[PDB]
Amino acid sequence: EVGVQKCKNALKLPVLEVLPGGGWDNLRNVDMGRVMELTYSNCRTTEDGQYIIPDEIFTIPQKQSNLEMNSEILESWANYQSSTSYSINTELSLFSKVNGKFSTEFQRMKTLQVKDQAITTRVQVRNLVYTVKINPTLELSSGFRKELLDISDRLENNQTRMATYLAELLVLNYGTHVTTSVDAGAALIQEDHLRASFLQDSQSSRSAVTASAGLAFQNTVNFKFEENYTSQNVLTKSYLSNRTNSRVQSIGGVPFYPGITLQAWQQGITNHLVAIDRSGLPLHFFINPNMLPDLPGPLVKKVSKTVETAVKRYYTFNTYPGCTDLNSPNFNFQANTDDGSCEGKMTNFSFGGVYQECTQLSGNRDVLLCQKLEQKNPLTGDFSCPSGYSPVHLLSQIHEEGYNHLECCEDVFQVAKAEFRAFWCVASSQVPENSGLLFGTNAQSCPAGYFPLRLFENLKVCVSQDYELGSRFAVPFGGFFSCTVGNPLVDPAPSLKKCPGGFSQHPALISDGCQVSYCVKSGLFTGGSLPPARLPPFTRPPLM
Amino acid sequence: EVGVQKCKNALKLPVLEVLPGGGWDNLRNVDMGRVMELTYSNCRTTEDGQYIIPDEIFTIPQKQSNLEMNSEILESWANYQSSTSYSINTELSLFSKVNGKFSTEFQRMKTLQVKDQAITTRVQVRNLVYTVKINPTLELSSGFRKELLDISDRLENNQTRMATYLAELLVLNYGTHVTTSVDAGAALIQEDHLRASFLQDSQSSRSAVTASAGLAFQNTVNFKFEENYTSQNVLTKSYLSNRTNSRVQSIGGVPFYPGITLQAWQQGITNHLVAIDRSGLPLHFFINPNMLPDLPGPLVKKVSKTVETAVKRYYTFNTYPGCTDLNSPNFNFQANTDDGSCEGKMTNFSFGGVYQECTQLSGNRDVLLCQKLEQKNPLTGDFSCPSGYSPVHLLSQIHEEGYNHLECCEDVFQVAKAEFRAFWCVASSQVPENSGLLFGTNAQSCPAGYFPLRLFENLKVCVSQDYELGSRFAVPFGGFFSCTVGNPLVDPAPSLKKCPGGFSQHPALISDGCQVSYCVKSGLFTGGSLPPARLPPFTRPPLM
Amino acid sequence: EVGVQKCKNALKLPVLEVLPGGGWDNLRNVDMGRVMELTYSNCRTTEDGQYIIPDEIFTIPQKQSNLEMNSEILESWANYQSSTSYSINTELSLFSKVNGKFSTEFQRMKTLQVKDQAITTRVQVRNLVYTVKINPTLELSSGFRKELLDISDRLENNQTRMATYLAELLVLNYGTHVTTSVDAGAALIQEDHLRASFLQDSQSSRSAVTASAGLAFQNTVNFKFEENYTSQNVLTKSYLSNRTNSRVQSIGGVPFYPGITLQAWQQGITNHLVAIDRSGLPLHFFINPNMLPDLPGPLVKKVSKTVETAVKRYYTFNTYPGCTDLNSPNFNFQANTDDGSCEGKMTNFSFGGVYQECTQLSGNRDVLLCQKLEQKNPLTGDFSCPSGYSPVHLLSQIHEEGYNHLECCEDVFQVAKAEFRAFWCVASSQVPENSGLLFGTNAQSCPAGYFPLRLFENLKVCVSQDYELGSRFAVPFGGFFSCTVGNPLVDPAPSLKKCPGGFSQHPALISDGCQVSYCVKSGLFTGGSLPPARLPPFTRPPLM
Ligand SMILES: *[C@@H]1O[C@H](CO)[C@@H](O[C@@H]2O[C@H](CO)[C@@H](O)[C@H](O)[C@H]2NC(C)=O)[C@H](O)[C@H]1NC(C)=O
Ligand SMILES: *[C@@H]1O[C@H](CO)[C@@H](O[C@@H]2O[C@H](CO)[C@@H](O)[C@H](O)[C@H]2NC(C)=O)[C@H](O)[C@H]1NC(C)=O
Ligand SMILES: *[C@@H]1O[C@H](CO)[C@@H](O[C@@H]2O[C@H](CO)[C@@H](O)[C@H](O)[C@H]2NC(C)=O)[C@H](O)[C@H]1NC(C)=O
Ligand SMILES: *[C@@H]1O[C@H](CO)[C@@H](O[C@@H]2O[C@H](CO)[C@@H](O)[C@H](O)[C@H]2NC(C)=O)[C@H](O)[C@H]1NC(C)=O
Ligand SMILES: *[C@@H]1O[C@H](CO)[C@@H](O[C@@H]2O[C@H](CO)[C@@H](O)[C@H](O)[C@H]2NC(C)=O)[C@H](O)[C@H]1NC(C)=O
Ligand SMILES: *[C@@H]1O[C@H](CO)[C@@H](O[C@@H]2O[C@H](CO)[C@@H](O)[C@H](O)[C@H]2NC(C)=O)[C@H](O)[C@H]1NC(C)=O
């Protein structure tokens, strides 16, 4: 045809295999989408005469190299460097303590450092070879344009809750940032871990331990399968006995195997390139009146706002407070950001129960969903909390449902609205251990003897009334907090939204705009593997 | 086609891969943009007959070389040489102590010298090969022309605050200087660090320590993987035991590996060239009536002024005073420029609180934003500071917001204006330790017990009222200073804008024209990594 | 095309890569511009038949060579030889003690000789191969012609201060001299430094120390990487222990590495040539009535005068008097020319202050700039110097500013003029140490306690009133001198323009025609790196 293939039949050259203009998810370092365009218009080459480039980029060669002889120690896993995306993870002073905390590389480092009390160590060979950018005169792609008018067309007829669902679908396909800088090259990076007690017993030889690791790295590369290397004489015997694991990885060129020299690895560095860092801008910056020609003036300033709150919602859902200091008790694993809420003693409390009733405000006739909302108290029954309830609001939203009506041969569809709220009970002033509720396997069910019952259409947290077997798996309760109201149990919403000292928060049942939570000291809820990131959508689409 | 490709099909020669005319960011040594043009008009070569050049440059060959046998010691990290941009970082006697203080190379040298009390050492091989320039008869590019009329078209209709936003967008894409000189070549530079106590114990052998380092550098290059080199006999045993780390880097030719001779490295020096220094002029010099033909006379002299204040604003935001001497107490890390404000004892003070109220000057009806501005005192409440307030001004600006009105089928858009100011409270004359405020993890929240509340729509600095747990994380307060007014607490705005001896300034919440600050002696706010540079824009765009 | 490329397709020969006719900056040995022309008119070759030359030059071959066996000692860094530009740096008996004092080569020699009490030593191999010149029948270039009529067109309508700005723009782009002689060739030059005490202890063996250095230079070239060379037997052991550093550089041919014989270096000397000396004439000599045809008679004699004063102004700005003898106290580093003002004892003085007022001579109405000029005394206030003022003039010039007036739909632009002068105070006859002013980090601010305030719109030199902390960083004041008036404090403008014995001058705030100065004995202002040359422009352009 005519296009990309026309240039390769006239010059006999490869194409550069790394371009900017794509999207970039920021909290998971992975690429998707093409938010810009590139058209192989006429013909172009790099000035060295080795590649074929698109029409609007420009390259400036650097041809650098690096080789270090001493490894370095980066501690304190709450702040780290990713060695493949470093210029893009620190910019703009945004909510950046959560940034980069869900990569494939980060979750393997945190799992290693907490099991055997470890600190890490790395040594690399860089070999930078290029740097490309983009000129500021640019257009959007054909794909990104067709789905950008759609969020404007559903917004010009005044439909809130119908554009925010289309907005959160845009972050899933095109990421949060737009990378406009890259640089090709290779690397050869050899990570290592060491025990914590080894680093402290000989502090004066801190320049002598890392000097051995840089010498041992060149013996793994430059020698063959056997062991004729000279590090096994004096000091590497107290080494090689406190390291837990190590791995050598390479992100460029021919695949690495122990036995090639350093000469032969850098010889075949051409035609195998990848980005080793990048930098860009947020997504709410490329929605400009200069960028979109035909859309009107004061309408594109609202599109740039409604896509900003979606990517701000994506940052505030999957974030977790809690303690992070390793030597203290109640060390809350599965917690990325620090809170400083450690060193707090605990005091027990008491809980009453929960019973739900339906309201049915705007449903006059032909509405049958009120008895689905029903849930009674397992201790008393009807509208009589034992002694402890005092009114909070905690929730207000609408649950809709639609039905097909037969009006006759021809059918018109209509829906009905409602309103719902639940209740809760707690200890009143001072009631002794008698008439106390015991609160609750990797199952859908509670342990034996306990009985669960529904709360909010998908979750189950159990209530039980026994005093011989119920203390086998009982956990003390801390208190709910929510989107607007705060926890009244703290400070013995005028207060803040957290949990008192000695407990740990947990997420539960996000529902249409913001989520609710609870906290409970268990010691067993914290264990397990690390959770993946919670991806959008969040709000279910209204059905017109 | 016809153009660049027409010349290469008739001569069979490469193209020179380094040209002037691009932009150059000055405080981060990196390149972007093409503020000049080059058109491959007819045909040209260099007079040696090895490259193809643009139509308006001229090259003068030099063919130099260098090789030194003794390394040198550059101390005092506040002033340094970058070895890749030296002729451009010292010119014009501008605000140049901040110049070059945010490169990739500089931030790695400062981190090494402060951890282990180090001084550096380098030895290089230069091999200069060319020097190109530009003739003074020149035009602007097509891209730079189209975005230069736009800052004139929005200025001819008298819109201040709408051109300064377009001005600060120009510094982001095209840098602060314009490089018109380069010189191709290579290098081979081997940095090294040494302890501070080693250099002082034998001062008479200062010509003998550096003579060994120059001999050891040629053994790493010219010999193979093993160790048959003759430096391990007499004096290198007291060496190789105080060095912390070292790295060999090369910025030209084939990639470096230990084992090539010095002969084979300089043989393949052709077709791999890069700039190793450069020099240029500021950006407010290439806006001239001779440069732009069609724009009128006394209008281009205003464009050259409004782009000068933007690049002067970019230099004065990211700069930090504070102490820099390493041996003294309160050593303020993360501080580039010196102040001389060390050796000052400290005295505690007391702070009262902060409460905010809205004004609503020009909003008669249909304006609902006044209660968003509300913030009350956590100690007293209404308009009654305890004993200490005395009026300062500290701020005056406008907060705008717009709303879509329905005038009917057809919609016209209009906005509303306002004015705001906050308040503050401090100790009056002499009040004892009773009724004193305790002032405040890498989180959005304060530590436990403390409560934060909003100040200026994005920041939070906490107030707390307790006297048992509040002293766990209390910090003494120093005083605010701002854009126009000064700190009255100094000299125990007629005074200057700084903080008394023993504290350290910090930036906070830049808002529309200049920023405010505070200072607090912590000992823990200074630690951490180095911050990246704060890039423009600064002023949010008005919405017409 | 037809031109340069037509000759190379018929003869298959290279082009000579070094031509005269360009410009030449004299105090910085670097090249720019093409003030003459060369047109490859018909065809030509050198008579040997190896190169292609322009139409109006002529070459006379010499084919010389040199090789010396004994190095030589050049002392006294105030006068030196540059070894690449020697015939052009000594001519015409002009202001030549400042000539060549700002090269890249000179600033590295002065830094080495002052740190370790050193004297230099060199030995070279010359190999001259050609010499070209230009016939006196010649034309100007197309580029230099178009910018030469412009300085005449703005001069024929009687605009002083509008042509001198265009004159100083010509020296920036085309240098001060015009080189019309060169000679191609190579070199191989090996510099060296030695201690000062080694040369004096054995004066009788002065022919024996330099005889060893010439023998050791041929062993570095002609032998391989190892050490099988025979200089390590008798006398080189008391050598190689007082040298500080050495470097081998080469400015022609293939790049140098230790290991090629002297045979192989001179074999590939073809097609790699550069100038190793040159000589020319000043720039005010090529503006002649025979040179420019169309311009009238008595008008070109004024153009030759107004460009002579600009290049004389460029020589007198960046020049510094002061002491230069190394063994004496108050050794003023950063001083190129000698003054002989050493060996002078010192006596303290006292200073009063400075207060400024505006005049507003020719501004009747709509002029608002007078209160910007205001600056009051920090000690007394209004028009009352304490006891010491006596009138001098010291300054007279005009500060202009323009404003856009709305006369209506149509706008005409007009400016307003003024006049300004500052004041100063000093000790009267004999006042004791009471009521004395203490006069003042690499910052914009003074040290702590001190307060700065504005003097002349860009500079700040501080005044302070304290007697406990102010003596921490106090410096004694010497006295101002200026363009026309002299210092009255000397000879205890009828006197000269200098500073009494024991102090050191410094430049400050050049403003529109000539600069002012001051002097202060510090001991700390002299330290630091060497400053670069101050480039033109100097006078800001009037705005018509
Ligand atoms: C445009 O959208 C707004 C909501 O953003 C609608 O305003 C609501 O109007 C109803 C009655 O018409 C009120 O009961 C609601 O309280 C309003 N919402 C709010 C948040 O106050 C408005 O009706 C819509 N207009 C059209 C033509 O659809
Ligand atoms: C972990 O490293 C420590 C060093 O910090 C090792 O402890 C030393 O081992 C040597 C080897 O024989 C002994 O001579 C020392 O007496 C040990 N103690 C100290 C305080 O130096 C330790 O052996 C390593 N761990 C394991 C499992 O080998
Ligand atoms: C041109 O811009 C100036 C501001 O630079 C405008 O001057 C303001 O005019 C209003 C009333 O018209 C005054 O209340 C303001 O105080 C003025 N500004 C200042 C800084 O004094 C001027 O109105 C503009 N003219 C046009 C036609 O838009
Ligand atoms: C750092 O260097 C110093 C030299 O300045 C070393 O100190 C000397 O080391 C030699 C080696 O055996 C001893 O003979 C000397 O007695 C030491 N002291 C002095 C004052 O010369 C020091 O050992 C080095 N640091 C380390 C950790 O080895
Ligand atoms: C030509 O330039 C001269 C200055 O070189 C002008 O002379 C000035 O004339 C004004 C009044 O016309 C006097 O007040 C000044 O004192 C004169 N200058 C000097 C230095 O004495 C002259 O006016 C100019 N002529 C024209 C036609 O522009
Ligand atoms: C600098 O050179 C001087 C010679 O001028 C050296 O001094 C002599 O060194 C020899 C070598 O053993 C001794 O035998 C002599 O006694 C020394 N003195 C004299 C007066 O000749 C000196 O050693 C050199 N500097 C250094 C640091 O070695």
Nearest ligand to the CA of B157 is 3
Do the bridges between strand C188-195 and strand C124-125 make them parallel or antiparallel, or are there none, so unpaired? antiparallel
HSE, side-chain direction, 13 A CA sphere, residue B235: 12
For residue B274, what are its two tokens?
């890069």
**Distances C178 to A6, B62, B112, C169, C527 between C-alpha atoms, Å:** 52, 19, 49, 17, 36
DSSP state of C52: B
Calpha distance C176→C284 (Å, rounded): 9
Q: Is the CB of C158 under 6 A from ligand 5?
A: yes
Check B297 against C225: CB less than 8 A apart: no
Residues B482 and B422 sit within 8 Å (Cβ to Cβ)? no
- Going B254 to B260 to B261 to B267, the CA torsion angle's sign is negative
- Give the CA-trace dihedral at B230, B231, B232, B238, to 10 degrees: 170
For residue C399, give every residue at least 6 positions away whose Cβ sits within 8 Å of its Cβ, in sequence order, or none.
C369, C418, C419, C420
Phi-psi region at B434: left, alpha or beta (left = phi > 0; alpha = psi -120 to 50): beta
**Own/partner pairs, B36-44, CB within 8 angstroms, 24+ separation:** B36/B134, B36/B138, B36/B139, B36/B140, B36/B141, B36/B178, B37/B138, B37/B139, B37/B140, B37/B141, B37/B142, B40/B3, B40/B4, B40/B7, B42/C1, B43/B7, B43/B10, B43/B11, B43/C1, B43/C5, B44/C4
Residues A122 and A191 sit within 8 Å (Cβ to Cβ)? yes
Mutate to test the interface with C, among B73, B207, B278 (most CBs of C within 10 A): B207
Check A135 against B146: CB less than 8 A apart: no
Mutate to test the interface with B, among C445, C458, C468 (most CBs of B within 10 A): C445
**Distances B106 to A172, A496, B78 between C-alpha atoms, Å:** 38, 43, 10
Chains C and B touch (3+ CB pairs under 8 A): yes
Calpha distance B277→B297 (Å, rounded): 36
Let me know if B474 is exposed, middle or buried by CB neighbors in 10 A (0-12, 13-18, 19+).
middle
Nearest ligand to the CA of A195 is 2
- Going B522 to B524 to B530 to B532, the CA torsion angle's sign is negative
Degrees to nearest 5, angle at CA A81 with A77 and A86: 150
Calpha distance A102→A317 (Å, rounded): 13
Q: A216 C-alpha to center of ligand 2: Å?
A: 20
Q: C495 C-alpha to center of ligand 1: Å?
A: 88
User: Pick from C1, C448, C452: which is nearest to B501 by CB?
Assistant: C448
Residues C251 and C274 sit within 8 Å (Cβ to Cβ)? yes
Calpha distance A10→A15 (Å, rounded): 13
Where does A34-135 show beta strands of DSSP type E? 58-59, 118-121, 124-125, 132-133
For residue C239, give every residue at least 6 positions away whose Cβ sits within 8 Å of its Cβ, in sequence order, or none.
C209, C212, C213
Residues A188 and A256 sit within 8 Å (Cβ to Cβ)? yes
Q: C155 C-alpha to center of ligand 5: Å?
A: 14
Calpha distance C177→C311 (Å, rounded): 10
Q: Which among A503, A505, A508 has a CA at the least distance from the CA of A348?
A: A503
Q: Is the CB of B157 under 6 A from ligand 3?
A: no
Calpha distance C223→C260 (Å, rounded): 8
DSSP state of C185: E
Check C448 against B341: CB less than 8 A apart: yes
How many CB pairs (< 8 A) connect A and B? Answer: 128
Nearest chain C Cα distance for residue B223, angstroms: 9
Chain B residues closer than 8 Å to C413 by CB: 298
**CB-CB neighbours of B450 under 10 Å:** 22
Calpha distance B134→B180 (Å, rounded): 7
Residues B435 and B428 sit within 8 Å (Cβ to Cβ)? no
Q: Which chains touch C (3 or more CB pairs under 8 A)?
A: B
From B155, B157, B158, B161, give the residue whose CB has the most ligand 3 atoms within 8 Å, as the site to mutate: B158
Quick one: how far is CA A25 from the chain centroid? Answer: 10
Tell me which residue has tokens 């780390």. B245
Calpha distance A518→A327 (Å, rounded): 25
Check B263 against C257: CB less than 8 A apart: yes
Quick one: how far is CA A451 from the chain centroid? Answer: 34
**Distances A24 to A165, C455, C543 between C-alpha atoms, Å:** 21, 53, 50
Give the method of determination. Answer: cryo-EM
Chain B residues closer than 8 Å to A137 by CB: 143, 146
Q: Which among B503, B498, B446, B448 has a CA at the least distance from the CA of B476?
A: B503
Do the bridges between strand A124-125 and strand B420-421 make them parallel or antiparallel, or are there none, so unpaired? unpaired
Q: Which among B79, B21, B15, B91 has a CA at the least distance from the CA of B53?
A: B15
Residues C463 and C439 sit within 8 Å (Cβ to Cβ)? yes
Do the bridges between strand C118-121 and strand C177-185 make them parallel or antiparallel, or are there none, so unpaired? unpaired
Nearest ligand to the CA of B411 is 1
- Going B71 to B74 to B77 to B81, the CA torsion angle's sign is negative
Residues C334 and C530 sit within 8 Å (Cβ to Cβ)? yes
Calpha distance C4→C191 (Å, rounded): 41
Residues B192 and B122 sit within 8 Å (Cβ to Cβ)? yes
Calpha distance B58→C17 (Å, rounded): 12
Residues A441 and A314 sit within 8 Å (Cβ to Cβ)? no
Nearest ligand to the CA of A201 is 2
**CB-CB neighbours of A253 under 10 Å:** 22
Nearest chain B Cα distance for residue C484, angstroms: 26
**Distances C135 to B47, C128, C132, C279, C285 between C-alpha atoms, Å:** 22, 22, 10, 15, 16
Question: Residue B278 phi/psi, 5° resolution?
Answer: -165, 170
Q: Is the CB of B404 under 6 A from ligand 3?
A: no
Alpha helices in A154-229 (DSSP H): 164-174, 196-201, 206-222
Mutate to test the interface with B, among A339, A487, A491, A499 (most CBs of B within 10 A): A339
Check B207 against C243: CB less than 8 A apart: yes
Give the SS3 label for residue C39. coil
Let me know if C394 is exposed, middle or buried by CB neighbors in 10 A (0-12, 13-18, 19+).
middle
Residues C318 and C101 sit within 8 Å (Cβ to Cβ)? no
For residue C160, what are its two tokens?
């002083």
- For ligand 3, atom 8, the nearest C-alpha belongs to B158
Q: B237 C-alpha to center of ligand 4: Å?
A: 10
Let me know if A5 is exposed, middle or buried by CB neighbors in 10 A (0-12, 13-18, 19+).
exposed
Q: Is the CB of B201 under 6 A from ligand 4?
A: yes
Chain B residues closer than 8 Å to A64 by CB: 249-251
**At residue C295, what is the residue type?**
L
Chains C and A touch (3+ CB pairs under 8 A): no
Residues C369 and C418 sit within 8 Å (Cβ to Cβ)? yes
- For ligand 4, atom 21, the nearest C-alpha belongs to B201
Chains B and A touch (3+ CB pairs under 8 A): yes
Residues A405 and A413 sit within 8 Å (Cβ to Cβ)? yes
For residue B407, give every residue at least 6 positions away whose Cβ sits within 8 Å of its Cβ, in sequence order, or none.
none
Chain C residues closer than 8 Å to B301 by CB: 543
Chain C residues closer than 8 Å to B43 by CB: 1, 5
Phi-psi region at C528: left, alpha or beta (left = phi > 0; alpha = psi -120 to 50): left
Calpha distance B238→A442 (Å, rounded): 62
Q: Is the CB of B207 under 6 A from ligand 3?
A: no
For residue B186, give every residue at least 6 positions away whose Cβ sits within 8 Å of its Cβ, in sequence order, or none.
B127, B129, B250, B251, B252, B253, B269, B272, B273, B274, B276
User: Pick from A47, A65, A69: which is nearest to B249 by CB?
Assistant: A65
3-state helix vs strand vs coil in chain B, percent to 5: 20, 20, 60
Check A43 against B1: CB less than 8 A apart: yes
First to last CA, chain B: 46
Residues B256 and A65 sit within 8 Å (Cβ to Cβ)? yes
Q: Which helix (H) or strand (E) holds C145?
A: helix C142-153
Chain C residues closer than 8 Å to B70 by CB: 244-246
Residues B348 and B476 sit within 8 Å (Cβ to Cβ)? yes
Number of the ligand 5 atom closest to the C-alpha atom of C158: 1
Declared resolution, Å: 3.6
**At residue A432, what is the residue type?**
P
Give the SS3 label for residue B242. coil
Calpha distance B405→A12 (Å, rounded): 62
Nearest chain B Cα distance for residue C491, angstroms: 34
Q: Which among C95, C120, C123 has a CA at the least distance from the CA of C109?
A: C120
Number of the ligand 1 atom closest to the C-alpha atom of A160: 5
Chain B residues closer than 8 Å to C102 by CB: none
**CB-CB neighbours of C538 under 10 Å:** 19
DSSP state of B471: G
Calpha distance B383→C172 (Å, rounded): 65
Give the SS3 label for residue C192. strand
Residue of A nearest to B6 (CA): A43
Calpha distance B283→B310 (Å, rounded): 11
DSSP state of B164: H
